[PDB]
Curated annotation (Swiss-Prot), chains A, B:
Residues 1-304 are cytoplasmic. It catalyses: TSAVLQ-|-SGFRK-NH2 and SGVTFQ-|-GKFKK the two peptides corresponding to the two self-cleavage sites of the SARS 3C-like proteinase are the two most reactive peptide substrates. The enzyme exhibits a strong preference for substrates containing Gln at P1 position and Leu at P2 position. Changing residue 49 to A: Does not affect ability to cleave and inactivate human TRMT1. Changing residue 142 to A: Does not affect ability to cleave and inactivate human TRMT1. This is 3C-like proteinase nsp5. The active site is at residues 41, 145. The chain holds residues 3264 to 3567 of 7096 of the full protein.
Length: 304, 304
């Protein structure tokens, strides 16, 4: 029993973190096979960041200007290219600790683990969600750029995120591992505002199921609803619309608990309208939206 | 910016997890040098657990009855002893991945990372606190026993917890690595109730400091208080008494923010008396008590 905000074990990713330095900028890189991936803004001064022309800045850079360090051993850079907003540094050594891995672009609402790194050294691991506005709410200080987000399926690390930017509101933007930003963000120090940070409705429902499974049942009511009725209340509370796809995804949790998805919608509807009234659910005073239905099944079933 | 419930990177501990089987019971062990540490209840049937005589049960066990598996390779058990509530299995191979390590007994309020394991395989990592009643609020399914809690200081893993028990209220009890339970708990399936789960006041204050540092300031008031005045309100709200030792510990956060500890006490006092009024602090609707002042300094400074 018990339900915790749980990150993947970080070891397989720890083994891939390196330090990348270009002149006076140091940040983190991901070493997979004989390639190091890092944010292309490694080539920028904070002055450059106001209005960087990456192609022009990059002409001034040779392989020997990228200093790659894995532990306290230097890697030899034998080539470099820009793909979107990431640099790929070809090194002469394949990372011996390269895990099985994929690059995947996640959808809003999808959760992942972040291994926060400074100077190529892991400092911590926490669980995030891609917010519906394509930001994440991370913990990233200066030097944390090139820290990555990942999921693990048995022994395969799916890398979904590389950290690039803090917005002026202190939320976080970054790229997939082909250097494409999530959302409309760019690697430039300019006015960039996030849209509405809506609640990930399907994730809240999953977490309400986790609560029932773990004995927190006080919020279960005598009501049901329909997707259209629920969705009218969801809109009003800046919750993402619930689709039949989401209902389908919640089916196994529905089955295990014997609570119809629409019944749990009606419980969530009353929680939105009536509040928690100073009560908690799984030790939270707000509705948690950073567990996916898959996360809840995983933690409630004990997958490794 | 941003502040997250953050676990230590788990790799160094992943490298120490093994599967221990005695007859029909499988759980997790910790392999350090040529010793495997596991809960002594590995020798019990669920029937045994009602009223186990561990010394008598153990006479029936030989080295060959303990099956230790690291990945998919079997370790040879060359000796076994009971220390308090743990078994120590001497194996013929030193764990090649043994990190620098200490066994430490933590105090209530101290935080640590848990690497939740099943069959010797890491499933996740989360951050806990030793509760003032010497329970933890974990996420532990059947097979999770022998999962460990740890802190890391640069490259030294301090192991503070091994998971043994779920109480009938679904909170968790376990031992230090010399097999001494935290609190009054025993490895027997019997009525064992936790005491009052009080809030770790010094941790809440630390987290209020983290909030101010990260721009969440709405709760800062025009009032101050004294330890005796604050403590009268703390008692009433099932908060742990604040001592001058705690005030001393908060000094650096006091200094960095320029908010006197007693001023922040007066802010916390108003939050207790007045509630959050539907507002959040660092994305929480309740006062978070599972960050130590050291945790807050670490995450706000970027230690690796």
């Amino acid at each position: 029993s018990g339900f915790r905000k749980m990150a993947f074990p970080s070891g397989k990713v720890e083994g891939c973190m390196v330090q990348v330095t270009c002149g006076t900028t140091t940040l983190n890189g991901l070493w997979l096979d004989d390639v190091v991936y890092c944010p292309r803004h490694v080539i920028c001064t904070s002055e450059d960041m106001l209005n960087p022309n990456y192609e022009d800045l990059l002409i001034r850079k040779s392989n020997h200007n990228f200093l790659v360090q894995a532990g306290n051993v230097q890697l030899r850079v034998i080539g470099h290219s820009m793909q979107n907003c990431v640099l790929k540094l070809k090194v002469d050594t394949a990372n011996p600790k390269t895990p099985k891995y994929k690059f995947v672009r996640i959808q809003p609402g999808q959760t992942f683990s972040v291994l926060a790194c400074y100077n190529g050294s892991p400092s911590g691991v926490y669980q995030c969600a891609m917010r519906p506005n394509f930001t994440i709410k991370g913990s990233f200080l200066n030097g944390s750029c090139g820290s990555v987000g990942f999921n693990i399926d048995y022994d395969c690390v799916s890398f979904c995120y590389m950290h690039h930017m803090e917005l002026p509101t202190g939320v976080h933007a970054g790229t997939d591992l082909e250097g494409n930003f999530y959302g409309p963000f760019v690697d430039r120090q300019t006015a960039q505002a996030a849209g509405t940070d809506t609640t990930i409705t399907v994730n809240v429902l999953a977490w309400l199921y986790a609560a029932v499974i773990n004995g927190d049942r006080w919020f279960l009511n005598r009501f049901t609803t329909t997707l259209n009725d629920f969705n009218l209340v969801a809109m009003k509370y800046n919750y993402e619309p619930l689709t039949q796809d989401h209902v389908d995804i919640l089916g196994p949790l529905s089955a295990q608990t014997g609570i119809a998805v629409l019944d749990m919608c009606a419980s969530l509807k009353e929680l939105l309208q009536n509040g928690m009234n100073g009560r908690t659910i799984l030790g939270s005073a707000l509705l948690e939206d950073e567990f996916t239905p898959f996360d809840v099944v995983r933690q409630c079933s004990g997958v490794t």
